[PDB]
Amino acid sequence: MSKTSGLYTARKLRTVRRVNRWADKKYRKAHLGTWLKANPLEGACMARGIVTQKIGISAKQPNSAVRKAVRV
């Protein structure tokens, strides 16, 4: 039946779901813990810092512009 049935298979049905849950990129990003470590804001809405420089950044292929930004 491509999935196990039977009145005494709750343990298997739970193990399969626990294992295959990690295959989703959304769940893995939000639950693994590496993104929390690598996040510059450390899981916060906002953060304060001091400006170290002023810069201009080229746009991508179909557009043409110089966007204005700051290294913080």
Partner 1 sequence: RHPLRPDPDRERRALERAENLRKAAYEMAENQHERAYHKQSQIFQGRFLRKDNARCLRFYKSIGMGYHTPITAINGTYIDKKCPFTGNVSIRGRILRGVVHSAKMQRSIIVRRDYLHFVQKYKRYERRHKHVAAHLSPCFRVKEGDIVTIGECRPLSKTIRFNVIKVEPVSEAAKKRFSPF
Binding residues vs K ion (CB under 5 A): 2, 7-8, 20
What minimum distance in Å lies between the beta carbon of 13 and K ion? 10
CB nearer to partner 1: pick between 7 and 44: 7
Give the whole-angstrom CA distance, residue 42 versus residue 57.
Answer: 26
Q: Pick the closer one to partner 1 by CB: 3 or 25.
A: 3
- Which of 14, 67 has the CB closer to partner 1? 14
For residues 28, 33, 35, 39, the Cα torsion angle rounded to the nearest 10 degrees is: 160
- CB contact at 8 A, 17 and 10: no
